[PDB]
Design a protein around this ligand. Structure first.
Ligand code: ATP
Ligand code: ATP
Lengths: 115, 618, 609, 115
């Protein structure tokens, strides 16, 4: 029962999440108000994942899809212009949660439209 | 009608890719091996939380370099976890399989990760300097297995039958390319490690056979010594003697750091930082841009790069420092982040944090002037080259004044010294301290019940430029000035009394022809004969003297005894002259140098001086 | 008892290595695909030497971008050689297997390699911006096979049953990561290619449907154009209008390049180079290409600071190696190319040198940068020396080098004399050194400060020393005053020490020498010591007192020596005054600039009152 | 009958040569006065190589050995302080002969032992 690696990245109104495995099948959807869970196995290593959120997401307006070889997920927050210091609700010495600097920016969210 | 297939990159090449893909910087093999060895001890160490019987096999956690030139071999001993048979096989097929899995799934209720290193290549980089490798590992999970390769498509595994046993861990034998023997050299290994892998969590042991025999004496050494990373420990848990002792090691310096700023930032960046204001300026230069790079950056304990202009703006140059993140900014294979958005952020902080640090040193009588005698420039420099911190930086400036001569003064003091009847800050600049001090240049501002600063450094004016609005207050002087009524008594006569010198006004404008714009006789002076105020919204005469060095309006004092003579002779001689030729221009030229001016036409003037010793004393 | 095993790196990871190993510069997918596509045409093209029936299938050799936003797809058409079933399978297992083998063993009796690109990874970099890929290739060796992957551990191969056939070559379908749609943008593709893959051997075709709807108008474009590599053709095969037209394109400039230096170097480096001296100065140049593809561009590795302005371009076939495509990484290479781009570029000045006016047009532009180069070099110091042009007391409204000055001086001289200061005329007809003018020698005029900042590093020019202000001696001269020198200077010896005292400690000795005639006094800075003007500058950016005896205002001193010596009452505002007068006269600073002015107006007090 | 790739590199008194294949067996020695030849097969692809020299080597004082996965060779010249513009004696549009920039320097041979 292995564990996939993950990806924080707040912006203005949302948080998105990049998992990580090759050719995973049967993606286990779990859109808990304050939790996220997935038990997708890869084409064998069985991967499972659960995380307590830092804040209240919107299980209503969220899309989950698969890209290639990583699972992607995305959700809107419950605020206006605030910024999460983590994804979970705890002491983040979490080994497998690391930041996705590709999508990460913050501080300059809608604040990079010049040259 | 499809047919799926399995990617199958092939090795011979893939290796030569990793190794030969250049990196005219091939010392990294060591760094990489050590890293990989820290990784190992870090592994067993943690494995002892719940079972410390695992530690029995070797009570010490260390790595030991052992140069054996005699067979041209570089051994790297480590007492970390070591690999079983299968742990060699599996974990030594490239990239995939890394001692990361071991930490991928840790999830622990403490979850400590002293150890980072993925990619799962770093090992192969040994071939950069090694022709053949010899891995001997022993894990208290299997026997002593020997894993041997020559960068080929193949590797061998055998049970070590004869060859000294080890308690637990791994030994690496490097057979260096027949020239890479640079790496059997004491100084070299010291150079490399004590610069790339300095701040490891583990003692960095190095054998160096050295004898004092009368014509061998081995010595397990370099536990040396304040290796230790002073950012991993709580600020409170350190005072002077510990911060400063660190400084000295990381900057080959002899004096104590005037100040120090430990701190961190968290959120999604997560990096710690120590930074020092040194006691003295180098003293080197600088803005050659050729030299600077003091703030050395480490990710997860390992040295990455060191730099200047990404983290630290030019003018903060001097700040010796060090940064570290766990949240590995990513790095194409181990020498720079590659994502300079990261860079920018760390910069913001290392500034914001570093500014308050001055603002702190600010709260002090003398230890500030000790700092201000050191970096007067670099602050002023920062004022010019910033914008946002301009104001933050503004308060930090200290000059002289006609109110306080032998005494330092900021600007937040000047604002409180001025009455409500004033709204503009007045300052002058020029050659020296005394080359302006008791100079009746602006004596009718001194006796005008206001206050003026003294800006001896040229750089000063090169900053003040970018500040024509300080706390609503305007910055002024040499240039041009006005005030209200002032005692509506000689306001009243101004027009009438200047009109006395109006038949003298244009007359003086003519014998000097075209250089001036207007020749005025203003009471912004008392007994000093004449003055040359460069027009407003125009560069200073002194400014000129410098902006030109490396590549106008004429004021007369009416009450001056040598000027009343002019009004008399206006009648006794106007448009032309005979005796008042060597004089009309002469004083104009005198008042020129008076207004911090160049030796413009420097031979004709001298000749007037000795030419006006001709009638008086002869 | 051994047991050998076979290395077996594993894919999932190895990929994510290539792609995700960062490179905050992810436009390269295009460059890489094109390169990989050039590689292809280059392949079939050569394959026609001995059999041009192979070309029949598609007579044209080109690549065509085709943005199809409607399904968020980026097509890259190429009419190159294309792959067979097996050529897809085999050649698309990482690193190993590359379209290099194809050139590894060519050995040909011509052996042309327009095409380079190894590593055998560049393809996978497409996933940087593509979520899924679609390769459709047709080689006149097999049918149309479709190779599809999603950066996984697997790939699929199917015979294309329905989907428009192609003559020969390959089409690449990119389905971009749901945000990478920046790459369906016209301007963006133009930006990228027309900067990374500009100088390819092949037409760089781009479809761009426009807008026609009132109740669409596609256009196969950017054959523009205004691509072509001017270093691939013989110098003779180019003149002005072709070199300069190039410059303009590679440097978004409006004026004509003053000069140009095409050339190559061969041996074991093997690189070609075009370089331009621009017409004007402004307020990163020598873009470097390997095998036609853009690598980096730089300054301080190839070109020393002071040659900055030189816009250029370099190219080698002998690929200096490069960790995956963005710098050589071996800066020993760097150093060498530097040597040349200097040696070659110097003679280019030495050429522009052979000219009356077009040199002064260049010298009004880069007076500085040359002088700068003198200071910061050593080896070329002398090479650079000859290139300096100043004024002189021999030629006022007229330029002069130094190789002319050497021929103007008699055998009786061995040291070159120069002065410096504020301006042209702020020294010109200035009796500062009139007793060198009338001493039958010659002095230059160095108005720029930088000048002296170079002359420093030249106290040996062609054996000749450089000297300014100063100390001097000569033999007899006409052993008549000579004869009285000691006797007549001794007349002013009770005046000599007297003058040394009211000025106290600043001077070293106060002499009354005839190396002057009627100009009152002078301040010659001692020999083997920096000039007063030198000082004025070496200090700007961070002593001996001579009197003229025959001067009418100095004979007065000898009389008043008796009528007042050690102290004074009226001769207080005077003793120092003239010392300070003769100070500025000796190209000197405004040292104590407020007390002097006050004496001037203070000595208008008795004369005219 | 395939062809391995190669490597020029003059220094003061010698030229050295790096071939390129994995785990080659039976290295075919051929030290001709002006020629070099090798027919070593790798552990299958059979590789053979011949090259006309640019100058006269010394077949006397030369060592050939194998490193790993490439064959290395080395030989002294017949001069004092000269510098080869190529390895062969012809028109070098040779695809498989490329420069080894690792060992390459020239112009600063014994003149790079400096601070
Ligand atoms: N000294 C050692 N003791 C025990 N196991 C080791 C040791 N060194 C390496 N390993 C094992 O082999 C791999 C280490 O070599 P590798 O080339 O992967 O470097 P890495 O540190 O894993 O990743 P990288 O070095 O690329 O950051 C790990 O997977 C680990 O399991
Ligand atoms: N346009 C194309 N037509 C046919 N084959 C191609 C094309 N582009 C790529 N290939 C295939 O890709 C293989 C290697 O290319 P890849 O980009 O992966 O590495 P490379 O191009 O050899 O070197 P580089 O990694 O520097 O690009 C070739 O053997 C060839 O089969």
């Amino acid at each position: 029962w292995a564990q996939r690696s993950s990806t924080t990245d707040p912006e203005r109104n949302y948080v998105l999440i990049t998992v990580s495995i090759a050719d995973c099948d049967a993606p286990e959807l779990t859109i808990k108000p304050s939790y996220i869970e997935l038990k997708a196995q890869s084409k064998v290593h069985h991967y499972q994942l659960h995380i307590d959120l830092y804040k209240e997401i919107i299980p209503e307006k969220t899309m989950h899809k698969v890209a290639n070889g990583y699972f992607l997920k995305l959700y809107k927050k419950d605020l206006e212009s605030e910024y999460w210091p983590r994804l979970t609700k705890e002491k983040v010495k979490y080994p497998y949660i690391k930041t996705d600097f590709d999508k990460w920016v913050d501080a300059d969210e809608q604040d990079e439209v010049e040259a | 009608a499809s047919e799926t297939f399995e990617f199958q990159a092939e090795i011979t090449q893939l290796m030569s890719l990793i190794i030969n893909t250049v990196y005219s910087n091939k010392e990294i093999f060591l760094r990489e091996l050590i890293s990989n060895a820290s990784d190992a001890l870090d592994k067993i160490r943690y494995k002892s939380l719940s079972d410390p019987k695992q530690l029995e096999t070797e009570p010490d956690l260390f790595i030991r370099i052992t140069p054996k030139p005699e067979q041209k071999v570089l051994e790297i001993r480590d007492s970390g976890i070591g690999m079983t048979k299968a742990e060699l096989i599996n974990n030594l097929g490239t990239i995939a399989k890394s001692g990361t899995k071991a930490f991928m799934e840790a999830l622990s209720a403490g979850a400590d990760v002293s150890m980072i290193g993925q990619f799962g290549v770093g090992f192969y980089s040994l071939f950069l300097v090694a022709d053949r490798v010899q891995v001997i590992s022993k894990s208290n999970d299997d026997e002593q297995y020997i894993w041997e390769s020559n960068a080929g498509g193949s590797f061998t595994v055998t049970l070590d039958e004869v060859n000294e046993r080890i308690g637990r861990g791994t030994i690496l034998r490097l057979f260096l390319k027949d020239d890479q023997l640079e790496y059997l050299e004491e100084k070299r290994i010291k150079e490399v490690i004590k610069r790339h892998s300095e701040f490891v969590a583990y003692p960095i042991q190095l054998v160096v056979t050295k004898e004092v025999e009368k014509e061998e004496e081995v010595q397990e050494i370099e536990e040396l010594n304040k290796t230790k990373p002073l950012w991993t420990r709580n600020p409170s848990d350190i005072t002077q003697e510990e911060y400063n002792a660190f400084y000295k090691s990381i900057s080959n310096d002899w004096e104590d750091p005037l100040y120090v700023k430990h701190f961190s930032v968290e959120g999604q960046l997560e990096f710690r930082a120590i930074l020092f204001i040194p006691k003295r300026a180098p003293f080197d230069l600088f803005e050659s841009k050729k030299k600077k790079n003091n703030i050395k950056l480490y990710v997860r304990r390992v040295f990455i790069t060191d730099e200047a202009e990404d983290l630290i703006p030019e003018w903060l140059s001097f700040v010796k420092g060090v940064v570290d993140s766990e949240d590995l900014p990513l790095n194409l294979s181990r020498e720079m982040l590659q994502q300079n958005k990261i860079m920018k952020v760390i910069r913001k902080n290392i500034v914001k944090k570093l500014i308050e640090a001055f603002n702190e040193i600010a709260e002090d009588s003398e230890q500030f002037e000790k700092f201000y005698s050191a970096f007067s420039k670099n602050i002023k420099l920062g004022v010019h080259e910033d914008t946002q911190n301009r104001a933050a930086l503004a308060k930090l400036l200290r000059y002289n004044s006609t109110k306080s001569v032998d005494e330092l003064t900021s600007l937040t003091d000047y604002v409180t010294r001025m009455p409500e009847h004033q709204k503009n800050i007045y300052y002058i600049t020029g050659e020296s301290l005394k080359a302006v001090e008791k100079s009746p240049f602006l004596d009718a501002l001194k006796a005008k019940n206001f206050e003026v600063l003294f800006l001896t450094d040229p750089i000063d004016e090169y900053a003040f430029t970018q500040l024509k609005e300080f706390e609503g207050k305007t910055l002024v002087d040499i240039t041009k000035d006005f005030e209200l009524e002032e005692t509506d008594e000689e306001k009243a006569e101004r027009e009438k009394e200047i009109k006395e010198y109006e038949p003298l006004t244009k007359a003086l404008k003519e014998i000097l022809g075209d250089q001036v714009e207007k020749v005025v006789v203003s009471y912004k002076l008392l007994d000093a004969p004449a003055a040359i105020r460069t027009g407003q919204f125009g560069w200073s005469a002194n400014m000129e003297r410098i902006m030109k060095a490396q590549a106008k309006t004429f004021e007369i004092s009416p009450k001056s005894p040598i000027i009343k003579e002019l009004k008399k002779r206006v009648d006794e001689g106007g448009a032309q002259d005979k005796t008042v030729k060597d004089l009309t221009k002469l004083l104009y030229e005198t008042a020129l140098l008076t207004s911090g001016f160049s030796l413009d036409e420097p031979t004709s003037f001298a000749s007037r001086i000795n030419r006006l010793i001709s009638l008086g004393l002869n």
